């Protein structure tokens, strides 16, 4: 069937240009029965249509009035794709950007969508996280269970991947969504509830991977010594 | 069921969607009518410039218009009852885009080079400069250019040696007393102002070589 | 432009329940309305267009109704794969979307299991102190976490993060992080996290002495 494959860099610095591409398979960018759109989604403003292009006797475009002065949507008939160009970006342009197909001119909804591309507009330099243990203790136990974890602090940009025991430990795991700190860097916690009977027999290691900075940290998480040694 | 032409100024600010006119079928006195519009600007390219409210008949403008892009739209109104049956014949909807002064006058050349003999009488045609304006010069003054001389270099014997016809752009000698040995060349700052002198101005130069008798 | 307002912002339901979501347009759109379903990390999925027309391949349990300014999406028998955020969209004048209705899993009220973690010695050597309060496996999402340092109520020095509903037990977990400098952290003794939740008869305090 029709598939839309997105490509393009996520990180854009303020006042610079955002450039994304949508590759089409199972259809033509020049189709006389379709229109090709860009739609963004931010936690603040929600889903927002940005513009469309469509081919009939010639090429036509329509842009959202909010972005009209900064936006360009262009077809590439040779590569069967269409691009998104958004000039002079500000942190208000941070969103997940989607390309979408509208049957006809879009007056029947958008049935086909790309996978989405997270765009972050920030001046922050790429930084690998610092990883700290959240040691199990008498303040983290109840019944037959103990909670422990890892604090993955001061990284940029998103995402980080967190696994426990090289992915062999998945039950009782909660990896929290990242929070943006006032510094412009992200921070997250990943916790796991384990049997308290296992604290001396099973070793717990959190595997932290931050692909943008090529950082890999394996941190052993265990109780503190009963005697300050 | 008939609609008068709709007149809309270009570069409008809505707010959008902007109500234009309400389509109404006399047949609505007995049953519920559903309205639709077709044509270039509605359901065909450029699509979605206009829409209609199906249950009310209100014709809507969805965006600012550009007279120099599309000056006129011809659409069709349709009135149907709930059973799908047409209650009216198609209605012609004409939408005229009226002009705004969104183009500045433009001289055809930055420098115009002309000549005149030294022993010429007042009223003698020197050269003709040209400026164009993309706006409407028929129904408005937006495309109407008014020509003028801003300055003359040098001012010997006096400043007002030449004149320019306000609408034609023809430069004429107005004062006798020209001499190649005295002053061989004149640099006339010439202006073209749209809205017949009340709009924007553009400047070009008219270089006049004084030919020996 | 036309604004689309959805109601409620979230609702809780059980598998087999009839669920009704509403959408209000700022002006009459007649039937120029589409409904989308969106799952976390995925693009929206078209369910209905022309207010009541079911998109090809979409289950018959989804139906749309309404005209003019007031619209409804109905899920006749909620299936496990139906828990998602639903969006309405108008296409009368360009394309505008509602803010969504999250359809979540109803379950019995479960009090959080509250745990506290002092900053690690490794982090303290770096000059910063992050104190973590963990509220584990609770229902409903609604929970108040308050930080107290030597009984002094804190403000603007903590951030919270909540996980999505658990795929096995339908509970939520929250982490609250109190961030201080090493200098500020060392100036105090008692670090308390006070939790207010529907499942707790009276607020629960979890603390440590540094
Ligand atoms: Ca224009
Ligand atoms: Ca003009
Ligand atoms: Ca004009």
Pick the CATH number of C113-209 from 2.60.40.1180, 3.90.1150.10, 2.60.40.10, 3.30.950.10: 2.60.40.10
- Taking alpha carbons only, the member of C106, C53, C49 closest to residue C78 is C106
Q: Ligand 2 centre and the CA of B65: distance in Å?
A: 17
Chain centre distance of CA B129:
20
DSSP letter for C121, please: H
Q: Test A107 with C91 for CB contact under 8 angstroms.
A: yes
Are residue B88 and residue B108 in the same domain, yes or no? no
CA distance A33 to A105: 8
Q: Ligand 2 centre and the CA of B160: distance in Å?
A: 28
3 state SS of A107: coil
How far off is chain A from B7, nearest CA to CA, in Å?
A: 23
Determine contact, residues C43/A113, Cβ cutoff 8 Å: yes
CA B125 to each of CA B1, B109, B122, C138: distance values in angstroms, whole numbers, following the listed order = 60, 19, 9, 95
B102 touches chain A (CB under 8 A): no
Q: Test C31 with B16 for CB contact under 8 angstroms.
A: no
* Backbone torsions φ then ψ of A209, nearest 5 degrees: -125, 120
Are residue B107 and residue B135 in the same domain, yes or no? yes
CA distance B114 to B186: 10
3 state SS of A199: coil
Are residue B93 and residue B138 in the same domain, yes or no? no
Please, what is the end-to-end C-alpha distance for chain A in angstroms? 64
CA A180 to each of CA A154, A186, C58, C128, C154: distance values in angstroms, whole numbers, following the listed order = 9, 5, 38, 17, 20
Q: Which domain holds residue B54?
A: 2-100
Q: Test B47 with A54 for CB contact under 8 angstroms.
A: yes
CATH superfamily ID and name for C4-105 = Immunoglobulins (2.60.40.10)
- Taking alpha carbons only, the member of B85, A150, A47, A179 closest to residue C89 is A47
Are residue B48 and residue B126 in the same domain, yes or no? no
CA distance C181 to C178: 10
Identify whether B120 is preceded by a cis peptide bond (ω within 30 of 0): no
Final residue before a domain boundary, out of B42, B72, B100: B100
Instruction: Please give the CATH topology (third level) of the domain spanning A3-121.
Output: Immunoglobulin-like (2.60.40)
Q: Test A54 with B46 for CB contact under 8 angstroms.
A: no
Residue B25 corresponds to which tokens in the numbers above? 């079928």
Residue C122 Ramachandran class (φ > 0 left, ψ -120 to 50 alpha, else beta): alpha
* Backbone torsions φ then ψ of B157, nearest 5 degrees: -70, -40
Q: Could you state, in order of their start, the residue ranges of all structural domains in chain C? A: 4-105, 113-209
| Class of residue C183 by CB neighbours under 10 A (exposed 0-12, middle 13-18, buried 19+) | exposed
Q: State the count of interchain CB pairs (< 8 A) between A and C.
A: 118
Are residue B110 and residue B154 in the same domain, yes or no? yes
Are residue B95 and residue B110 in the same domain, yes or no? no
As a whole number of Å, the CA-based R_g of chain C is 23
Q: How many CB atoms lie within 10 A of CB A79?
A: 12
Please, what is the end-to-end C-alpha distance for chain C in angstroms? 57
CA distance B85 to B79: 9
Q: Test A46 with C97 for CB contact under 8 angstroms.
A: yes
Q: Test B45 with A65 for CB contact under 8 angstroms.
A: no
Secondary structure of chain C in the HEC alphabet? Answer: CCCEEEECCEEEECCCCCEEEEEEECCCCCCCEEEEEECCCCCCEEEEECCCEECCCCCCCEEEEEECCEEEEEECCCCHHHCCEEEEEECCCCCEECCCEEEEECCCCECCEEEEECCCHHHHHCCEEEEEEEEEEEECCCEEEEEEECCEECCCCEEEEECCCCCCCCCEEEEEEEEEEHHHHHCCCEEEEEEEECCCCCCEEEEEEC
- Taking alpha carbons only, the member of C199, C174, C166, C197 closest to residue C83 is C166
Are residue B188 and residue B151 in the same domain, yes or no? yes
Q: State the count of interchain CB pairs (< 8 A) between B and C.
A: 25
CA distance B209 to B137: 33
Determine contact, residues B170/B125, Cβ cutoff 8 Å: yes
Q: Which residues surround ligand 1, an ion (CB under 5 A)?
A: B 10, 66, 68, 102
Taking each continuous run of H as one helix and of E as one strand, the counts in chain A are 0, 20
Same fold, C4-105 and C113-209: yes
* Backbone torsions φ then ψ of B152, nearest 5 degrees: -125, 130
CA distance B174 to B122: 4
Positive or negative torsion for Cα A206, A211, A212, A215:
positive
For A60, the closest of B16, B43, B45 (CB atoms) is: B45
B51 touches chain C (CB under 8 A): yes
Resolution in A: 2.1
Q: How many CB atoms lie within 10 A of CB B86?
A: 10
Residue C20 corresponds to which tokens in the numbers above? 């009704």
Positive or negative torsion for Cα A158, A164, A167, A170:
negative
Greatest alpha-carbon span in chain B: 93
How far off is chain C from B111, nearest CA to CA, in Å?
A: 47
Q: Which chains touch A (3 or more CB pairs under 8 A)?
A: B, C
DSSP letter for A34, please: E
CA distance B73 to B117: 54
DSSP letter for A156, please: B
Residue A212 Ramachandran class (φ > 0 left, ψ -120 to 50 alpha, else beta): alpha
Q: Test A56 with B45 for CB contact under 8 angstroms.
A: yes
Determine contact, residues A147/C134, Cβ cutoff 8 Å: yes
| Class of residue B80 by CB neighbours under 10 A (exposed 0-12, middle 13-18, buried 19+) | middle
Determine contact, residues B112/B207, Cβ cutoff 8 Å: yes
CA distance A69 to A35: 21
Residue A144 corresponds to which tokens in the numbers above? 């037959």
């Amino acid at each position: 069937q029709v598939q839309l494959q997105q490509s393009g860099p996520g990180l854009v610095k303020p006042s610079q240009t955002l450039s994304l591409t949508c590759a089409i398979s199972g259809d033509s960018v020049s189709s006389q029965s379709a229109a090709w759109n860009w739609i963004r989604q931010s936690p603040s403003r929600g889903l927002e249509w940005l513009g469309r292009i469509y081919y009939r006797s010639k090429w036509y475009n329509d842009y959202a009035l909010s972005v009209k002065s900064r936006i360009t949507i262009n077809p590439d008939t040779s590569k069967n794709q269409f691009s998104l160009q958004l000039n002079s970006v500000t942190p208000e342009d941070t969103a997940v950007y989607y390309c979408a197909r509208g049957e006809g001119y879009g007056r029947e909804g958008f049935a086909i969508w790309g996978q989405g591309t997270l765009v972050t507009v920030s001046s922050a330099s790429t930084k690998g996280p610092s990883v700290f243990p959240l040691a199990p203790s008498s303040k983290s136990t109840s019944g037959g269970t103990a909670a422990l974890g890892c604090l993955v602090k001061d990284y940029f940009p998103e995402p980080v991947t967190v696994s426990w025991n090289s992915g062999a430990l998945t039950s009782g795991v909660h990896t929290f969504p990242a929070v943006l700190q006032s510094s412009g860097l992200y921070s997250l916690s990943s916790v796991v509830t384990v049997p308290s009977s296992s604290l001396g027999t099973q070793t717990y290691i959190c595997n932290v991977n931050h692909k943008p900075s090529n950082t890999k940290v394996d941190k052993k998480v265990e109780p503190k010594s009963e005697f300050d040694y | 069921w008939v609609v008068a032409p709709i007149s809309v100024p270009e570069n409008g600010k809505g707010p959008f969607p902007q109500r234009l006119n309400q389509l109404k079928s006399n047949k609505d006195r007995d049953t519920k009518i559903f309205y639709s519009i077709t044509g270039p600007g509605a359901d065909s390219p450029p699509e979605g410039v206009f829409a209609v409210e199906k249950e009310t008949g209100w014709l809507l403008l969805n965006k600012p218009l550009d007279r120099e892009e599309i000056a006129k739209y011809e659409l069709f109104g349709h009135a149907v009852s709930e059973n799908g049956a047409s209650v009216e014949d198609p209605m012609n909807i004409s939408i005229i885009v009226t002009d705004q002064n969104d183009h500045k006058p433009k001289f055809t050349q930055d420098t115009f080079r002309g000549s005149v003999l030294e022993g010429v009488l007042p009223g003698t045609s020197v050269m003709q400069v040209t400026a164009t304006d993309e706006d409407d010069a028929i129904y408005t003054y937006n495309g109407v250019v008014a020509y003028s001389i801003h300055s003359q270099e040098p001012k010997d014997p006096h400043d007002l040696m030449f004149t320019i016809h306000r609408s034609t752009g023809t430069i004429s000698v107005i004062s006798s007393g020209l001499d190649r040995e005295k002053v061989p060349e004149y640099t006339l700052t010439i202006q073209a102002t749209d809205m017949d002198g009340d709009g924007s101005t553009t400047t070009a130069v008219a270089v006049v070589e004084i030919l020996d008798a | 432009d036309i604004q689309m307002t959805q109601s409620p912002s979230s609702l809780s339901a059980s598998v087999g329940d009839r669920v009704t979501i509403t959408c209000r347009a700022s002006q009459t759109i007649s039937n120029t309305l589409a409904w989308y379903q969106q799952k976390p990390g995925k693009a929206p999925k078209l369910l209905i267009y022309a207010a009541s027309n079911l998109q090809s391949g979409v289950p018959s349990r989804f139906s749309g109704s309404g005209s003019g300014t007031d619209f409804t999406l109905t899920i006749s028998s909620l299936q496990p794969e139906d828990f998602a955020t639903y969006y309405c969209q108008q296409y009368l004048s360009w394309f505008t979307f509602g803010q969504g209705t999250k359809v979540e899993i109803k379950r019995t009220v479960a009090a959080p299991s509250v745990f506290i973690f002092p900053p690690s010695d490794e982090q303290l050597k770096s000059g910063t102190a992050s104190v973590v309060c963990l509220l584990n496996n609770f229902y409903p999402r609604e929970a108040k976490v308050q930080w107290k340092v030597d009984n002094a109520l804190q403000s603007g020095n903590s951030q919270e993060s909540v996980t999505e509903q658990d795929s096995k037990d339908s509970t939520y977990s929250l982490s609250s992080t109190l961030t201080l400098s090493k200098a500020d952290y060392e100036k105090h003794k008692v670090y308390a996290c006070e939790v207010t939740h529907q499942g707790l008869s009276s607020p629960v305090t979890k603390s440590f002495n540094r």
